[model samples]
Target chain A: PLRLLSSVHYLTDGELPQLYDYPDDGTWLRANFISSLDGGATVDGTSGAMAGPGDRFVFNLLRELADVIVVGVGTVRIEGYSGVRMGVVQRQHRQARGQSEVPQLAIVTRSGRLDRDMAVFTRTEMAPLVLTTTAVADDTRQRLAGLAEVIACSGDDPGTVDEAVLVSQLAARGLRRILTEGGPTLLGTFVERDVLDELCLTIAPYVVGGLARRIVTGPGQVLTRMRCAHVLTDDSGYLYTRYVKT
Target chain B: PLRLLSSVHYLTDGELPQLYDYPDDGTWLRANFISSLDGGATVDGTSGAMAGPGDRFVFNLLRELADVIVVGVGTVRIEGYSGVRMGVVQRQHRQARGQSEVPQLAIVTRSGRLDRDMAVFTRTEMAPLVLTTTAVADDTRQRLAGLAEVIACSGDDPGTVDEAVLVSQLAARGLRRILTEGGPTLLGTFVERDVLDELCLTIAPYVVGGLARRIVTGPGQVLTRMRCAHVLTDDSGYLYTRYVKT
Candidate 1:
C-alpha cells in the first residue's frame, strides 16, 4: 500500500491525491526517474528491476498530469517505448481533472527519421510528434510528414531542437504541462541550457552494481542548485522526492 | 532556512540532533558519502565538489560518534592520507558525550603496504590501524609493525579480508562503532557479502552529468534492499538520508 508519510493523504490505485504540481505560467519541463541506493539509473539493463508498484503508480500519474510525454529517439527504441496507453482508471482521472483524455507522445530527433512501423507511432490513436531543426533532411521531412507532426526547431543551432526551441514550440501548441522521461542525453540538453523546471525522483531501496550511466550526462559542466519541494516515503521504502530550482 | 518536510529536526552547524540510531546488536558498520543528484561520487575529481556546510557538519558529527573511522587504503592515499585533527567544536562535542576525545583511523590494506611515515600513521597520538591479509610480505609487515597496529584479517581469503574476516577481526578489536568513508571498491566487497549495515547518504542538489562510478562499484551484480531509517534536509538543498537493511 502507498502510505504517505508526512503527506497530504494516502495514495490508492486509480486515484492519486494530486502528488506533483506543475508550473502555471508557461512551459515547465519536469524529469522523472528511479535511482538505486548507489544511484544506478536502472537495475540490470531495464528499469523493471528497480521499479515497484509505487514507482509505476507515480510514472502513470505523471503521464496523467502531462499534455505531452517527451522522449529521445534513442531512448524510445532502446526502451522499446510505444504509444502512451492509459488504463480506464487513469483515463478517467485525467478527464475528471479537466486534462486531456490522452497525452500526446513527442520525440526529439535530428533526422525527423524513424520507422513508421514502430508500435509507438503505428499503434497509437494520436499521431506522435517530431521536434527537430530546420536543417532536417528533405527525405526525412517528407516521409515523417505522413506519420507525425514535424515542427521545425527555432533554435539557432539547426539539425536538432535545442532546449529553447523545444520548449517554445511546445508551449505555443499549449502543451505546457511538459514531462520528460529521460534517457540522460535529452535531459542533459534541457539541463545544460537551463530549461528544466523540476525533477521528480523516486529512490528505490536496492543496490545495482556495475557500470551504469546516471540520470543525466553532458559534455561540459553546469550546476543548477535546487530545493526539495516535498518528500514522501511509502510503505515499500520508496523515496518520492520533488525538487525545483531555488 | 531548510523547510522541514516530515523530517526529524533541522540540522545545525555543531549541534547535530540525535540523528542516527543504529542497531544495538553485533558489529554494525555504517558508511558516509555524498553523491550528486545524478549519482556522481564527487563533484569533480574529489568529493570536495559535493561537500557543503551541512555535509561538513555531518562529517564531523560522524567522526565524533565513531570509535574508529575506517577506510580503504586506496581511498586514503588517493584522498591524501592525513591526521585526524578535530576542531574545538568537535572536540567539545565528543567530550560532552563522555566518548573518546578522538577516533582512531583504520585503513584496509591488502598487502600491508603503505608509507608508514605518512602523517596519518606517524603524527597522531592514537596510532592508526592497518587491516591487512595474512599473505602480506614479511618485509612490509616488519616495517608497519613499528608505526601502527597491524591486524591481520583472519578471513579465509589471504589476498584480501574478503568481508567476513575483515569485520570479524575489527569487532574482535572492539572497533564496533565502525564508520567507513569509502572509495566504492571496498564498500562493494561489504555489500557483496551482505555485511554493510547502514549508509548515511547526502544527495547534493547539483546535477553532475557524466560517465562516473556510483557510490559503490563491483565486478559482479548485487541487489541489496534498504529502508530509509531517517531523512534530513538543509537550506542548501542537500538531502541527508540514512538507509538500513529492512
Candidate 2:
C-alpha cells in the first residue's frame, strides 16, 4: 500500500492530496536528498547508487510538482545531470496535473565558470539555465549564455548565491515552486542564509561503510528547527520525510 | 491530523501495529541511531547533540521492547554510560506491555578491559554485561566479573565480537529481541558479517558541518538494502523512521 505505516494518510497514485498543501502564494523551496543507513550521502562519490524504487517514486513526484529543479554544480558534474527529462507516463502525468511537460533544470555555480562543452549543456533536450553571481567574468557569462540561460543571483560583489535573492529571482521568473537536488553544500548554503523553506528527505535503506560525503557538506553549522509536516514509507522501509522550515 | 499524510498503517502510541511484526521464532535484532540532513552521525564528537523529543521516544521504545541493550565499548566509554535507567512513565509502560522493567546493558569490547570502579558498573541497578573474546587477559575478565557479567563470544584468538557468535551468546542468555546502540565500527562489524536485522533512525533537523563521523563506520563498503517499515514525526519535526532487514 502507498500509505504511511505510522498513521492514516493515503497516497492517491503516490501523491498526497491532503499533505501536499502548499502556500497560497504558490511558492516553496524544497530540498530532496538520500542517505545510507549509516548516514553516508553517497557511495563512491556518487549518490546515484542509493536510489531504490520508493525513492524514485518520491523523487519523480517532487520534480513533477515543481516548476524548476535547482541543482548545485557538483551534482551536475558528479551525477551527470542535464535537463529534466520525464518518462512517457510522467510527461502525461505532469501535463494532466496542469504542470509543465518538464521542469527546468537550473544550475547554481559560484566560481563563475562553465565549460560550454560540458555534457550538461549538449546532452539534454531542454537547455538548462544557470544561476550564478556577477563574480563571474564577462567572458564566462557570455560563454555560458551561448549554452544556457544565465541569471545572476548576485550583484556587485557577485560570487555566491544568497538564498533570499535566489528565491526572489526564481519567483520573478514565475518559478515559485522550486525543487533543489543538492550536493549538500548548496543546501547548507541555503540554511545558512535562512531562505530554505522545506526539505523532502528520503532515507534510503543501505550502508556505505566509510569514506563517503554527507548529504549536506559545507562550512555551515546551523541549528535550524524544521516542522516535519509529513512522512511516508515504502515496504522497503525507505523514509520519505518532509520538513517545513519553522 | 494525527493521521499520516499518506495511506493508513497506524502507530499504536508510536509503535507500528503491523510493521512491528517480527520473525515467527519471536526473535529479532534492531539498531537505533540519529543522523543530520547532511549525514553527520554526531555533532561535537557525540550523537548526544542530535536528538530531539521524537528520538527520545523511539529510543525508549526500543529498549522497552528489547531483552538486552547492546552497545559498543567506545559508546560506553565516550558517553560515560552508566546503568540503563528508565523514566517513571517508561517503567510503567514496559510492565503494561508485559516487558521487563529494564533491559540488560551489554557491551561489546575487543580489549576486554574495564575498571571495576567504572561509572557504568557502579551506577546501574541492573548489572551490565560484557561481551568480549578470549583475547582478553584472565585478569581483565576477573576484574570485570567483580562488577558485571561477562559473556565470552569467542574462543582462542578472540578479540573482537563476531556477529554470529555474539548473537548466539545473546540468544543463549534469552535475549531474542535485541537493540544495539552503536559507535559505528561495531555495527559495521555486524554488517560486514551480514547479521544486522533492523535499523531505526531518527533524523533530527540539524546540520553539523565537517569534522563529524557517520552513524555507521568501519572499512567495508558493502551496499546492503533494507526494508523501510515505518516513519513517524513529532511536533519538533524530528523524523522517527524504522527499517527492517529484508
Candidate 3:
C-alpha cells in the first residue's frame, strides 16, 4: 500500500478561465508579511528598515507568484512603489506556463496622493489602479485618470474607505485572487473588518525588544484569533507560518 | 600626486596601432581559466567547470583589460571558446574614456583539433589566433586557416611551446598586455617559468576545502615572498586580493 507524504493541487490552464476570473473558489489570496527576527515590522516606522536574505526572498517571491500585488498608500509613500516586471527566467517560465507577460500593480490609496511621475508608472507595461475615497480632489483624479484606473469609493468619510466595499469592487472587476502586501494601517483595517482570508507570516530569527514597531498598527481591540495553520522549513532554515482567522 | 597603486598593468583594445602602444615592457601571453570554488577546474579533468558570479566578473574583467584572452586546446573543447565582449556599462564607459573593445581570443593547441562548426566562430566580431605545432594535420589546418591566424610553433613539445615560443609569437603580433586565464597545466607551466607577473585572487567567504586542488597546478618551486597589494571589501564582506610576483 502507498502512504501519502505530501501533495500540491494546482489549477490547470484549462480549468482556469481567462486571466481575470472572479468568484472562483479556486482563487486564493496569499498575504506575505516580512518582519524582523525580533517580530518588529519595521525599525523606524518604515518597512525598508528590515534587511535579511529571507526578506529578499519574500519580496522576490511575491513578485514571482502574484498576478496582482496590492500595496497601501502610506507604504507606497514611505518605501516608494515600483511596478513588477518578470525577470528573464520568470518571463520565460511564465510564457511557457501560459501566463501573462506582466503582472498588475494595485495601490490602495484613499487620498489619491501617489506620485504620478514615479519610475514605476513610466516604465511598466500597464498603468496601475489607484483605489481612492470620494474625498480625493477632482483635479488629482483627472491628472491620474489617464495613467491609472481611478477607483472612487461611494462613501463620504473624509479619510476612510470600507475594506469590504473595496474587495467587492475588485471582485466585480474580475480580480478575485488578490494578494495584499501592506503597510500597518491597511493590514489593521483588514484584520478589524475580518476581510483577510489567509496570512503567510515569515518570522525571521531576530529580536527587536520594545524599540521597534509591531506588525499591525492601529487603535482598536485585537480583531480575530488566528489558528496556527501550518509551518514550513525553508532551505535557509527560516520558519514560514500560515495563519487563518477562527 | 598620482602614484601607481601597482607597477603591473594589463589593458587591451581590438584597435590596430592603439592596442600595441599600451604596454611594451614584457611579452604578455593571455591565458584563460574557469574553475569551481573547490579549485577543481573541471568535473572530468577538462575545462568544463561551472562558473559562479565572481568567476564570471573576473573573466569579463580580464577580457576587458587584456591584450588577448588566451586558452588551450582542452579549454576550447570544453568551454566552446568564444570571442570577448564586456558588460554594457563597462563597454560604454570604455568608449567614453576613449578606449575600444578588448582584443581577440587566442587558442593554443598542438594537435589543432578544433571543430570549425561552432557558433562562436561565425557570430563573434573579434578574430582568433591559433598556435599549433608543425605536425598539425593539413586538413585541420586548411579548414581553420581562413578563420584564425594559425602560428605553427617549430618546437615539437606541446607543453613547452606555451612559454618559450607562444609568448614571443604573441609579442610579434603586437599584443603586449596579455592575460592568460588558463587550464591547470598551462598555468603550472607559466608558474614554473616565473613569467606570471600578477595574480588577482578574489576569496569569497566560502570554503570548499575538501577538494585536493591548488589555484595553480603542476610541479614547481613554491611562490615565495608574497605581499598584499590591495584588498577590496564589498558590502557582503567578500575580500578581493591582488598579488604581484615578488
Top TM-score model: 1
Q: Name model 1 segments beyond 4 Å from true.
A: A1-19, A92-99, A111-113, A159-161, A218-220, B1-17, B87-99, B111-113, B117-119
Tens digit of lDDT per residue, candidate 2, span B7-75?
344345644423443454655777888887667787777887778765765676677777788899888
After the best TM-score superposition of candidate 3, give how far the Cα of residue A122 lies from its true spot, in angstroms: 3.2
Report the Cα RMSD per candidate. 4.2, 4.5, 24.8
Cα lDDT computed for each candidate against the true fold: 0.74, 0.74, 0.53
Task: Quote each prediction's TM-score.
Answer: 0.88, 0.82, 0.42
Tell me candidate 3's TM-score on chain B.
Answer: 0.70
Residue-wise C-alpha lDDT for candidate 2, range A123-195, written one tens digit per residue: 6867787888867746566887668888888844676667677888888987888999896878778777777
- Give the per-residue lDDT digits (tens) of candidate 1, residues B1-246: 012146444344433536654445578788898887767785555776778667877777788777678888878877775767777876787678655678888888786767767656766768788888887845556887778888787466677676777777777877777888887888777777788888888888877665456787767466889987766676666777788876
Clashing pairs in 1: none
When sorted by lDDT, best at the front, the candidate numbers are 1, 2, 3
lDDT of 3 by residue, B1-246 (tens): 001111122222332123212244676543444422212233334432344333455556566667676767655655565767667866775466455565667777766777787544665667688776766735557878668877765455643354666677777876666777665555666656655655444433221211223345544433222233343323222223344444
Considering just the first chain, candidate 2 attains a TM-score of: 0.89
Clashes (candidate 1): 0
lDDT, candidate 2, residue A183?
A: 68
DockQ of candidate 3 against the true complex: 0.01
